[PDB]
């Protein structure tokens, strides 16, 4: 957040979950980052740079996260036509 | 005639006169005259597309529009070859009115019918361009720039009648209204 100078304030800028577009607080212990491993996709062997996600507790606790994690990987890979 | 068959539209004009002459000639010819019955136009116009091609427009008096819809395909086929290298479509001309609720002055002349309104005419124009599909659905989408794109779901029969006219029909509507339209064939037919 900006000021007169454009100087940035706020002690931490919180992170905003992928499929809910809302922000998770300092205490919120049902919110998970989930690391998918990429592969080279020529031999199907692990190669470094991961795809990382974040999900909030609200969609987790109702049981909607399973669709969100699927759709996120469906707009990328690995998922073709499921 | 061949020059005074375009009233309220200005009788002299080269291209429009050259249409009328050979048009009425076909109707007078004995080759087809058992479904052609000496109708006349009221104007005509030629308008392009971004496909790099021209297409001709035929206006009618509009009570006579109904009779054109009878033959409409045989006639258009013959004139597709006779005037070749351009696409051919019929359309109708209305005397659209400003509102008395105010876009031009009223004098308590008459009510203003709601078939003589603006919006009903722009709906009726679309009905003629793709008349052989007999429009199944209409949908619209609105853009973030405040533009609008008008989807039209057509019948899944009579496809190839309109499939080589599919883009060139869209360019017609642009010139008459000022709007952008797209034509689609749907997932499923009921």
């Amino acid at each position: 957040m900006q000021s007169n100078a454009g100087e940035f304030v706020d002690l931490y800028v919180p992170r905003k979950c992928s499929a809910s577009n809302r922000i998770i607080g300092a205490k919120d212990h049902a919110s998970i980052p989930m690391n998918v491993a990429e592969v080279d996709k020529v031999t199907g062997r692990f190669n470094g740079q991961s795809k990382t996600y974040a999900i909030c507790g609200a969609i987790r606790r109702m049981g909607e996260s399973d669709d969100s994690i699927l759709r996120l990987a469906k707009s990328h890979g690995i998922v073709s036509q499921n | 005639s061949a020059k005074i068959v375009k009233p309220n539209g200005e009788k002299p004009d080269e291209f429009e006169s050259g249409i009328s002459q050979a048009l009425l000639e076909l109707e007078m010819n004995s080759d087809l005259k058992a479904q052609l019955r000496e109708l006349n136009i009221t104007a005509a116009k030629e308008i392009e597309v971004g496909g790099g091609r021209k297409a001709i427009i035929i206006f009618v008096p509009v009570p006579q529009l109904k009779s054109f819809q009878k033959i409409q395909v045989r006639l258009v086929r013959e004139l597709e070859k006779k005037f070749s290298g351009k696409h051919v479509v019929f359309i109708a001309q209305r005397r659209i009115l400003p509102k008395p609720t105010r876009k031009s002055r009223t004098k308590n002349k008459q009510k203003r019918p709601r078939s003589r309104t603006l919006t009903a005419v722009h709906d009726a124009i679309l009905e003629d361009l793709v008349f052989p599909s007999e429009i199944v659905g209409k949908r619209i989408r609105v853009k973030l720039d405040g533009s609008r794109l008008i989807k039209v779901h057509l019948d899944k029969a009579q496809q190839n009648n309109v499939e080589h006219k599919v883009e060139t029909f869209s360019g017609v509507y642009k010139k008459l209204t000022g709007k952008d339209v797209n034509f689609e064939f749907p997932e499923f037919q009921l």
Binding site: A30, G44, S50, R61, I78, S80 | -
Partner: protein, 208 residues
């Protein structure tokens, strides 16, 4: 799948899926399990798609790879069928098994001597191991498990469908899970027969 046919399901594995009856799935359904099913028979039994099983296997396994420590991907199962299977899993691949009764408070205490902080979980059957799932949402653990048609989804991030009512469906699936993580991380890769088989991930089955 992703890569064109060097990750996609082979003709071989299809026989194993059908011989272990994984395709079959129970009578009762959930509204989160509707898409995974294709259809019903003429009888009460609903046939899980095997293509849809296969895609979920991969990113599940790829997440088990994505951690840089294989000693803190804590697997859990408490059903008798899922005891022998998990024991070989976490013996072969570096992982931590928690076999039998969970003994609650082991993801939230500072006094218990079985206290652990893992990152992932891999659970068999939500409705036998509901306890670790509830405690996972107090300390931010990603979660994976094996769902059936009638098993509800809640405090799980990804499912791996299976028949799993106590069958060869169980041990086969845990074997396949351990096979994939080695194709990406390990040197077992070649994708032509591995020495270890699914004939010892199957149930103890009281002998003569």
């Amino acid at each position: 799948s992703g890569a064109l046919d060097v990750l996609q399901m082979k003709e071989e594995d299809v026989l194993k899926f059908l011989a272990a009856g994984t395709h079959l799935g129970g009578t009762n359904l959930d509204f989160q399990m509707e898409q995974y099913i294709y259809k019903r028979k003429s009888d009460g039994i609903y046939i899980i798609n095997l293509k849809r099983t296969w895609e979920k296997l991969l990113l599940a396994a790829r997440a088990i790879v994505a951690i840089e420590n294989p000693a803190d991907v804590s697997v859990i199962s408490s059903r008798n069928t899922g005891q022998r299977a998990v024991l070989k899993f976490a013996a072969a691949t570096g992982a931590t098994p928690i076999a039998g009764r969970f003994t609650p408070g082991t993801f939230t205490n500072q006094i218990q001597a079985a206290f652990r902080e893992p990152r992932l979980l891999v659970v068999t059957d939500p409705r036998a191991d509901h306890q670790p799932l509830t405690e996972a949402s107090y300390v931010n653990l990603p979660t994976i498990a094996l769902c059936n048609t009638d098993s509800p989804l809640r405090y799980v991030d990804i499912a791996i469908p299976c028949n799993n009512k106590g069958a060869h469906s169980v041990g086969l699936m845990w074997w396949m899970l351990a096979r994939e993580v080695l194709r990406m991380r390990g040197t077992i890769s070649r994708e032509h027969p591995w020495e270890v088989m699914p004939d010892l991930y199957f149930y103890r089955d009281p002998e003569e």
